[PDB]
Amino acid sequence: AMGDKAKLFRNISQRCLRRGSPEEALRFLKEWARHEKNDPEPLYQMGIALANLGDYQRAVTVFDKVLKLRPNHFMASYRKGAVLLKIKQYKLALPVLEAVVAAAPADARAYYLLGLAYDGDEQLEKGIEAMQKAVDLDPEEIKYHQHLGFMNVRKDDHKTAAEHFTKVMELERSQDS
């Protein structure tokens, strides 16, 4: 069922993304979409390009189109959640990211973005919960110890904050050796 036209445009879109030129890639992803309408994949790709170009509000709108077509499109929720966070729309990113983690309950990064969303919404305790899951799921990652440390600072538990920051540095000494 995939047209020759659709194949051509996909092919050109990929070269344009692979030569780091998403401005051009967009023009051709829109063509793929024109021909295979209701294929969510070109829309999903448009979303990615739009997010690299930093037109975040437009990227959310396209990710919503793909989610209207495939309500459980798990990557489409992931990336929507991740730009909703960058935009600082924390309240609206929370249900999205919480759905990603239900699909992918060992994805450390999902839980990190979730913690940052909760933290931004002044749900400090739920932010700590989530970041703690990310640290347990990937204890070598430095970012997750950094944030968990500061979250503990904000709650005036300077003991547990210290613990995490000491670990932050052990990781840093260990990335030269």
Contact status: 56 vs Cl ion (CB under 5 A):
no
Contact status: 150 vs Cl ion (CB under 5 A):
yes
Q: How far is the CB of 170 from Cl ion (least distance, A)?
A: 20
Region 104-133 residues binding Cl ion, contact defined as CB under 5 A: none
Where residue 18 falls (left for φ over 0; alpha for ψ -120 to 50; beta otherwise) is: alpha
Q: How far is the CB of 172 from Cl ion (least distance, A)?
A: 18
Listed ranges 29-37, 70-78, 136-144, 146-154: which one lies at the site for Cl ion (CB under 5 A): 146-154
Contact status: 74 vs Cl ion (CB under 5 A):
no
Contact status: 167 vs Cl ion (CB under 5 A):
no
Query: How big is the CA angle at 137 (ends 97 and 165), to the nearest 5 degrees?
Result: 100
Q: Which residues contact 164 (CB under 8 A, 6 or more apart)?
A: 145, 146, 148, 149, 152
Q: Which one, 69 or 171, has the nearer CB to Cl ion?
A: 171
**Contact between residue 137 and residue 104 where contact means Cβ atoms under 8 Å apart:** no
Residue with tokens 């005036």: 156
Residues that bind Cl ion (CB under 5 A): 147, 150
